Design an enzyme around this catalytic site. Structure first.
Site, short mmCIF file in Angstrom:
data_model
loop_
_atom_site.label_atom_id
_atom_site.label_comp_id
_atom_site.label_asym_id
_atom_site.label_seq_id
_atom_site.Cartn_x
_atom_site.Cartn_y
_atom_site.Cartn_z
CB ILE A 100 6.47 -9.13 1.01
CG1 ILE A 100 5.39 -10.01 1.59
CG2 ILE A 100 7.45 -8.48 2.24
CD1 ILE A 100 4.71 -9.38 3.17
CB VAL B 149 3.29 -3.67 0.82
CG1 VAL B 149 2.89 -3.16 2.18
CG2 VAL B 149 2.27 -4.16 0.12
CD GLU B 150 7.12 -3.97 5.05
OE1 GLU B 150 7.88 -3.04 5.47
OE2 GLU B 150 6.13 -4.47 5.26
CB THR B 151 10.92 -0.54 -0.05
OG1 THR B 151 11.11 -1.88 -1.07
CG2 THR B 151 11.41 -1.02 1.30
CE1 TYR C 286 2.22 -6.97 6.01
CE2 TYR C 286 2.72 -4.76 5.47
CZ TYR C 286 3.31 -6.05 5.40
OH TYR C 286 4.40 -6.41 5.08
#
Ligand SMILES: [Ca+2]
Length: 297
Positions: A92, A95-97, A280
């Protein structure tokens, strides 16, 4: 005008000093670039064949393994306490940052104020998030103008909205602060807390490859990410993949070698709570698998 209104509401309802708030909003800027970004038309369709390699790359897996090496104890502790796999937490955040490389270009205050006051279609949603932001900044005793996020107000390593920070984030190193921006330990516990609270079931599988019998089986492909039938009912529709008495989604992806059929189990639906996209959630799951393999987990 409506700014004065919002301020009156924060003063009357939430106990904020009117003067302190007006001083704050004097320093806040309307960003045209945010209104443009939120405004954008739909992007061209990406097939899974194009979407997957954005996330499942040498660099992203490498940095993920590096992140895990550096935070191994914290990750083992979060897995134990929250019952969510370490590799899912790492994924997570990747993928996010990109593990803290890209955590957003704006002051949260500018983004939420711009959207809350100047973007009619979703002004109510962002006005609520602005209020939650003011509350969390007060709780954490930090200057509200000091915190960054994306153009849509998402904050820190895990890109939490203000309302998610208040609901789900945790002080995971016991120092009395919740810092998801530059404290990977708090970010790690906060993602684990979010997943447990959105129904992650410890030890249950997430997805399964499938094949179909007949063109008629394509009628069972789920529209969006909400399940409408049990796995046994999906098998009766001609899908072959697990317990039959659970709710599943049915996916048809265009991958690198041809059409791929996948079955999403309840933990897959839990991932889509973070971002409501089957691609996603598949990227998060597959990236977690690759990082766990490289770690020997
Ligand atoms: Ca902390």
């Amino acid at each position: 005008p409506q700014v004065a209104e919002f301020v009156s509401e924060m003063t009357r309802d939430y106990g904020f000093a009117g003067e302190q708030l007006m001083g704050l909003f004097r320093d806040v800027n309307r960003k045209q670039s945010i209104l443009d970004a939120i405004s954008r038309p739909a992007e061209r369709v990406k097939q899974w064949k194009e979407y997957r390699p954005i996330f499942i790359s040498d660099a992203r897996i490498s940095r993920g393994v590096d992140f895990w090496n550096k935070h191994a104890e914290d990750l083992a502790r979060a897995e134990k306490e929250y019952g969510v796999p370490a590799e899912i937490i790492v994924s997570i955040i990747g993928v996010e940052t990109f593990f803290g490389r890209n955590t957003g270009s704006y002051r949260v205050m500018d983004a939420l104020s711009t959207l809350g006051f100047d973007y009619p279609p979703r002004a109510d949603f962002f006005r609520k998030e602005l209020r939650e932001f003011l509350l969390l900044a007060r709780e954490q005793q930090v200057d509200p103008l000091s915190l960054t996020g994306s153009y849509a107000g998402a904050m820190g390593l895990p890109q939490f909205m203000p309302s998610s920070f208040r609901a789900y984030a945790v002080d995971f190193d016991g120092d009395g602060h919740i810092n998801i921006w530059s404290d990977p330990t708090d970010a790690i516990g906060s993602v684990a807390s979010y997943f447990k609270q959105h129904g992650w079931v410890t030890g249950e599988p997430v997805v399964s490859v499938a094949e179909i019998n007949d063109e008629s089986a394509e009628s069972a492909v789920t529209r969006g990410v909400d399940p409408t039938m049990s796995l046994g009912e999906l098998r009766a529709r001609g899908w072959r993949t697990l317990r039959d008495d659970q709710k599943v989604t049915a996916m048809r992806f265009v991958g690198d070698k041809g059409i791929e059929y996948w079955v999403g189990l309840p933990n897959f639906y839990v991932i889509t709570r973070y971002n409501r996209s089957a691609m996603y959630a598949m990227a998060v799951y597959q990236l977690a698998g690759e990082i766990a393999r490289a770690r020997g987990a």
